[PDB]
Amino acid sequence: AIDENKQKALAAALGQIEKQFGKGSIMRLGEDRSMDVETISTGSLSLDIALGAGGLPMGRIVEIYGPESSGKTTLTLQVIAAAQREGKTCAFIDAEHALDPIYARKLGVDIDNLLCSQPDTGEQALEICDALARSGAVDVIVVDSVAALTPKAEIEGEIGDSHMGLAARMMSQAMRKLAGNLKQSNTLLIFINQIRMKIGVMFGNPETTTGGNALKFYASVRLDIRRIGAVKEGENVVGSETRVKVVKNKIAAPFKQAEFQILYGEGINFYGELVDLGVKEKLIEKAGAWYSYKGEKIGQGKANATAWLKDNPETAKEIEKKVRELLLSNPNS
Amino acid sequence: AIDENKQKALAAALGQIEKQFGKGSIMRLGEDRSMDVETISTGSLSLDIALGAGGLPMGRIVEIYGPESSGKTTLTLQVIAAAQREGKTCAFIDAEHALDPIYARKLGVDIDNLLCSQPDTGEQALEICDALARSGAVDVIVVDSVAALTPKAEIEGEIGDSHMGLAARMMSQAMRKLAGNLKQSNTLLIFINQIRMKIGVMFGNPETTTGGNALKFYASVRLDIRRIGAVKEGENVVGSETRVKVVKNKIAAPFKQAEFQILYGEGINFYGELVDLGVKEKLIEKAGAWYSYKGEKIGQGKANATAWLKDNPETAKEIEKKVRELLLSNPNS
Amino acid sequence: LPLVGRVAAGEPLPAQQHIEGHYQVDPSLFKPNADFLLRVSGMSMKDIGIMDGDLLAVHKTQDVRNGQVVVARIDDEVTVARLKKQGNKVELLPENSEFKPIVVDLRQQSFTIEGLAVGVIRN
Amino acid sequence: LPLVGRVAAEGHYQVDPSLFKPNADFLLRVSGMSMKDIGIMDGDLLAVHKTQDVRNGQVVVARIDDEVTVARLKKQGNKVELLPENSEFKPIVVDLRQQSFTIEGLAVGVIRN
DNA sequence: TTTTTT
Numbered sequence: 082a083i084d085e086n087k088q089k090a091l092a093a094a095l096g097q098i099e100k101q102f103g104k105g106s107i108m109r110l111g112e113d114r115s116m117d118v119e120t121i122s123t124g125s126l127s128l129d130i131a132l133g134a135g136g137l138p139m140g141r142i143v144e145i146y147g148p149e150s151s152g153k154t155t156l157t158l159q160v161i162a163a164a165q166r167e168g169k170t171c172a173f174i175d176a177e178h179a180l181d182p183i184y185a186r187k188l189g190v191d192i193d194n195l196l197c198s199q200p201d202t203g204e205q206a207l208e209i210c211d212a213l214a215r216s217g218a219v220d221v222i223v224v225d226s227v228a229a230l231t232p233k234a235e236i237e238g239e240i241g242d243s244h245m246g247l248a249a250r251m252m253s254q255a256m257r258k259l260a261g262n263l264k265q266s267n268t269l270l271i272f273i274n275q276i277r278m279k280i281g282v283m284f285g286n287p288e289t290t291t292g293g294n295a296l297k298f299y300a301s302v303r304l305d306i307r308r309i310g311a312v313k314e315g316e317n318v319v320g321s322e323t324r325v326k327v328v329k330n331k332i333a334a335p336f337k338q339a340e341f342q343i344l345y346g347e348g349i350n351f352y353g354e355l356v357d358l359g360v361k362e363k364l365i366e367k368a369g370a371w372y373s374y375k376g377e378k379i380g381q382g383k384a385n386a387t388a389w390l391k392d393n394p395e396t397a398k399e400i401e402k403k404v405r406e407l408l409l410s411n412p413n414s
Numbered sequence: 415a416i417d418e419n420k421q422k423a424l425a426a427a428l429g430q431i432e433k434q435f436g437k438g439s440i441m442r443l444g445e446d447r448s449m450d451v452e453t454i455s456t457g458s459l460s461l462d463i464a465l466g467a468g469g470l471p472m473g474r475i476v477e478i479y480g481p482e483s484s485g486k487t488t489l490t491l492q493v494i495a496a497a498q499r500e501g502k503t504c505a506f507i508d509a510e511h512a513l514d515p516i517y518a519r520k521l522g523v524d525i526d527n528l529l530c531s532q533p534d535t536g537e538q539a540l541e542i543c544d545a546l547a548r549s550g551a552v553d554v555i556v557v558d559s560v561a562a563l564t565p566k567a568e569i570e571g572e573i574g575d576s577h578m579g580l581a582a583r584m585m586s587q588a589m590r591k592l593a594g595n596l597k598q599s600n601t602l603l604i605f606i607n608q609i610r611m612k613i614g615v616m617f618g619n620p621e622t623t624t625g626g627n628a629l630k631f632y633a634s635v636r637l638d639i640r641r642i643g644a645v646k647e648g649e650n651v652v653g654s655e656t657r658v659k660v661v662k663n664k665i666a667a668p669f670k671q672a673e674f675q676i677l678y679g680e681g682i683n684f685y686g687e688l689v690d691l692g693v694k695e696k697l698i699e700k701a702g703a704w705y706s707y708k709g710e711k712i713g714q715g716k717a718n719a720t721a722w723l724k725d726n727p728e729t730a731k732e733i734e735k736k737v738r739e740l741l742l743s744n745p746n747s
Numbered sequence: 748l749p750l751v752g753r754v755a756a757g758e759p760l761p762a763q764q765h766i767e768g769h770y771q772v773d774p775s776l777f778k779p780n781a782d783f784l785l786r787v788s789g790m791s792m793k794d795i796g797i798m799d800g801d802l803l804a805v806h807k808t809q810d811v812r813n814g815q816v817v818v819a820r821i822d823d824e825v826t827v828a829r830l831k832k833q834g835n836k837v838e839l840l841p842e843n844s845e846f847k848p849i850v851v852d853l854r855q856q857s858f859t860i861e862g863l864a865v866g867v868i869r870n
Numbered sequence: 871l872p873l874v875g876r877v878a879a880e881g882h883y884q885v886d887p888s889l890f891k892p893n894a895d896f897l898l899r900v901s902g903m904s905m906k907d908i909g910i911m912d913g914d915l916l917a918v919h920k921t922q923d924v925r926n927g928q929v930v931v932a933r934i935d936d937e938v939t940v941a942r943l944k945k946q947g948n949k950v951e952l953l954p955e956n957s958e959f960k961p962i963v964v965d966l967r968q969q970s971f972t973i974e975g976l977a978v979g980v981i982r983n
Numbered sequence: 984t985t986t987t988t989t
């Protein structure tokens with residue numbers, strides 16, 4: 082009687098909306114396969130575990146920020162290399178003009194297949210990202226240091242000229258124009274942010290991020306990467322002990338954190354994370370500093386265990402499969 | 415099938431961006447020769463080896479800082495002299511108003527070809543730096559003591575007035591506007607910084623560089639240069655032993671350190687670096703306090719051996735060619 | 748005198764500078780002059796009279812001595828307690844028998860003093 | 871808000887009366903340590919709203935034979951208990967047949983200098 | 984929105 086009329090009206094409205102705006106304009110959420118979350122590797126197993134879903138989501142906006150020499154660009158290049166190893170196409174909009182192609186090649190990035198752009202202005206950078214997203218042939222775009230996304234008016238202006246919130250307005254407009262395009266193209270955009278200090282904050286952390294507030298709202302995952310120690314070979318510092326805290330997460334539980342090592346010229350120590358997580362899951366027995374697998378003493382200490390694991394890839398693959406199976410909160414399909 | 419469509423869409427996107435923003439706006443990282451890192455000598459062989467790439471990267475940003483009378487100005491003047499020896503043009507934005515033309519000429523700088531400017535405000539200094547970068551005729555710019563880069567409002571105001579982080583805003587805007595111009599122009603900008611105390615720090619080294627956090631993020635190379643002792647000709651203190659730690663490096667492995675001698679009136683003692691690096695590579699035999707070369711006992715004591723090296727250019731040329739071959743990790747040619 | 752968030756009187760809680768409101772209190776009534784107010788959340792400081800729900804007036808300083816009641820922040824989490832610093836270890840002693848002192852390993856954890864407790868106002 | 875003496879537990883203080891419910895009428899210094907369990911300490915200013923009728927359970931500022939005190943009121947016929955908040959102290963039993971007991975107002979807030 | 988200073 083009444084419910085039948087309501088169903089007829091709802092079906093008529095649905096058909097009208099589909100006719101007006103397209104086949105995929107409106108549909109039931111349970112039958113919409115475009116809204117599924119597809120994740121991509123971060124190059125760090127511990128970070129993949131911390132993200133919950135198994136890596137950074139595709140088609141979303143992800144922000145990575147931290148203090149100086151914390152490993153933002155290196156982590157990002159690891160993400161890009163992991164993307165390229167599956168055959169995806171990636172782009173790097175280097176707004177700092179501080180990308181080293183040789184170091185990028187050392188991390189596992191195929192430089193010959195990486196699109197690199199050095200934009201003159203922030204508007205040009207954001208437009209390049211917009212065009213790449215609309216193309217649909219690029220799976221990951223990274224924008225280096227949205228603190229370097231200087232507006233055209235500011236570039237044409239003079240030093241000391243006041244451009245109140247112009248960069249924030251441009252960033253908000255870009256995020257508005259980019260969210261839907263990235264969702265449609267199934268393209269992951271990673272914005273690298275710099276850390277500034279806010280003045281006049283009377284309580285709490287004075288550390289703010291550049292680019293205004295729109296990037297905070299539109300980013301599905303926000304990472305705070307920090308350098309927490311030095312990996313020293315006695316007297317020579319050979320790496321960095323780095324902690325990444327997932328300050329925002331729209332695809333899993335937030336605030337989980339990961340710890341790993343970035344070794345200069347090699348990138349993220351995947352095998353070190355592997356040994357540590359195998360120890361965490363009772364898959365590698367750690368008697369003090371003695372690491373052993375299934376009784377067989379693989380070595381003494383993190384470095385020796387990593388070397389042994391590198392010498393024995395099969396055990397590495399087995400432990401990685403087990404760790405991904407257990408510790409992942411939201412295992413991807 | 416789908417791969418060809420992806421390639422066609424990617425080609426169309428690259429054509430669109432190239433037509434919209436310029437020929438070199440976007441292209442693959444492999445065939446971008448503008449992104450190659452090319453460096454110049456810093457005046458110290460030990461510092462060149464410590465930097466990894468063999469010098470300071472052109473088109474990038476370098477921040478040199480240390481305590482009082484640690485040799486920052488002398489180091490930058492030595493870099494300027496080395497650049498001028500290669501036909502390059504250099505500018506000195508003397509913001510501290512403490513540059514001596516006589517001493518600069520003593521160190522080897524051709525004063526007649528050094529564009530020296532004494533800005534009245536920090537904005538004037540940074541506008542001059544931007545103009546010099548955009549001009550393209552200046553290969554090295556040295557901004558002395560960015561602690562002296564005072565904003566115009568601070569100058570017009572009275573002493574004791576609070577300008578809450580105005581120089582930080584000025585420096586952030588300057589770096590934003592300057593990074594791209596420096597990269598496009600292939601100009602090396604060296605910011606000399608001072609050291610200030612951190613009030614109420616709890617853990618360690620309450621040292622801070624003036625000018626805010628922008629320079630930490632934007633400087634490709636950051637040097638901590640300190641005086642560790644005196645070099646005496648009997649009882650006359652004739653030089654200073656100086657240690658430079660590469661705190662931040664974007665072109666090679668960081669945290670390496672180098673030690674040299676700054677002789678008053680001569681600058682960097684190059685031949686002492688030559689002797690020490692030859693000894694380190696077994697090129698010069700060291701028997702106690704005696705140095706010998708290829709059987710020939712060359713002297714006793716570091717000073718007398720270096721005096722030998724002064725006496726005969728030929729063996730100095732031999733040993734410098736050899737050590738440059740064995741220790742320079744990234745030779746250009 | 749603005750109210751700019753909450754402070755944990757116990758196990759530290761993350762807190763943000765949210766200006767909930769401005770209260771008509773003469774800041775000069777406290778020595779030193781109070782800079783802001785914090786809504787106390789906990790009972791680790793009730794022995795001196797700082798109860799849950801009342802407003803602790805804080806004077807923004809960075810230098811404090813041992814035995815003072817201070818508002819500190821360890822790894823982005825704020826708390827209020829009596830300070831005791833010994834080299835690379837810190838102790839934020841509460842005023843409660845049921846609660847235990849909170850040790851801060853000043854070699855791995857970020858620790859920043861965020862002011863001094865200079866009085867309490869209850870509504 | 872005026873200060874008009876002490877309390878057995880001088881200046882105009884720039885405090886908004888509306889911050890207290892009911893609105894505070896005058897402030898009283900505290901002299902004593904018996905009100906400690908509910909946060910009222912020695913030396914603080916306690917806020918009082920001038921009224922005459924109260925019920926049980928509230929913490930009230932009473933005047934017993936011209937002597938001023940603050941405690942929790944418990945009325946039972948002709949027997950009043952001004953319960954304190956402290957273990958070392960004992961309650962003050964007002965036999966409401968021989969002593970004049972006057973309610974002066976309600977404790978509605980505390981302020982510490 | 985934008986930025987530390989000793």
Ligand SMILES: Nc1ncnc2c1ncn2[C@@H]1O[C@H](COP(=O)(O)OP(=O)(O)OP(O)(O)=S)[C@@H](O)[C@H]1O
Binds near residue numbers: 154155667
């Ligand atoms: N070419 C290189 N070779 C070796 N190590 C490098 C190189 N470039 C940077 N590093 C180091 O690798 C680590 C990762 O830092 P990066 O990711 O390059 O810098 P960042 O984290 O992006 O911060 P910024 O933007 O440079 S301030 C740091 O400890 C760097 O010092």
Ligand SMILES: Nc1ncnc2c1ncn2[C@@H]1O[C@H](COP(=O)(O)OP(=O)(O)OP(O)(O)=S)[C@@H](O)[C@H]1O
Binds near residue numbers: 481512
């Ligand atoms: N005209 C000069 N002749 C000889 N030695 C000098 C002269 N000027 C400075 N020196 C010394 O040379 C060393 C190098 O210091 P500088 O060249 O002044 O650079 P600096 O360490 O940054 O000192 P600043 O800029 O004044 S804080 C110091 O030990 C100076 O005392």
Ligand SMILES: [Mg+2]
Binds near residue numbers: 153225
């Ligand atoms: Mg970076």
Ligand SMILES: [Mg+2]
Binds near residue numbers: 510512559
């Ligand atoms: Mg100087």
